[PDB]
Design a protein around this nucleic acid. Sequence first.
DNA 1: AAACATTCGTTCACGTGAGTTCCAGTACAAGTCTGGTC
DNA 2: AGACTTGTACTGGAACTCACGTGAACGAATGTTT
Length: 198
Amino acid sequence: EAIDKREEGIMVKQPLSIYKPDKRGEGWLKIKPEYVSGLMDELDILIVGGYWGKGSRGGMMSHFLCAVAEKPPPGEKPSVFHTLSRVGSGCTMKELYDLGLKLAKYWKPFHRKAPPSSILCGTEKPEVYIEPCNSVIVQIKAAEIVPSDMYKTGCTLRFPRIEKIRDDKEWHECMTLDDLEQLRGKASGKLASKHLYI
DNA sequence: AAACATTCGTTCACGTGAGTTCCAGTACAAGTCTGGTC
DNA sequence: AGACTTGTACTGGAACTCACGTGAACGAATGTTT
């Protein structure tokens, strides 16, 4: 019912539970479509930019800016991209280092005065831009789609998190802009639009 | 009187169960990095 | 919000050792039979 009502989950409480400040779970629990496996629709999209990390992840790429591809003419590959959102979490340290090494040599500095033709940005400009012909397809378990004025697509993902840097799929198998619009209109925002059967 | 068995009696090797030390794997709390909007 | 890293604790499995039990080789001594 919560999913059908476009809600954000449910909360379960024990009748005998007592109030204990600063306790992460003593009788109060939260059930959301994110936790259940398979209910959400994973979003696989390309990587078009990266940013330098801060703190422990100093000398490496900590977060990345991803873009969806447009609809090319029949028999032609997509050469135009629109930025969707930014992903910083979901990748382990070893996987993050491997991804950085895989694209360390292909990284190219980004200049605001001369934005790349292949990648078109909105208000957020990546520090380093990478051309699309050589990139990995990152999978993100987005919670919902909200209207964003900082990206060309006009929409962004709430609580984005990387799930896997897929290697089987190539750079040309990313989502299309029409596919993104269809997904947005499927449930008017929240991606969780599937019931649970057991 | 000699040979066999038998016996028999022993003892050694091998196998199974209980206690002790060490380390791999798992659960929980907190720090740390990162996402977006007004 | 979320996910990963760090720590802390906590436990169960593996390896080692010893005690108990058993099987069975065998070696020789003795008794019986021819």
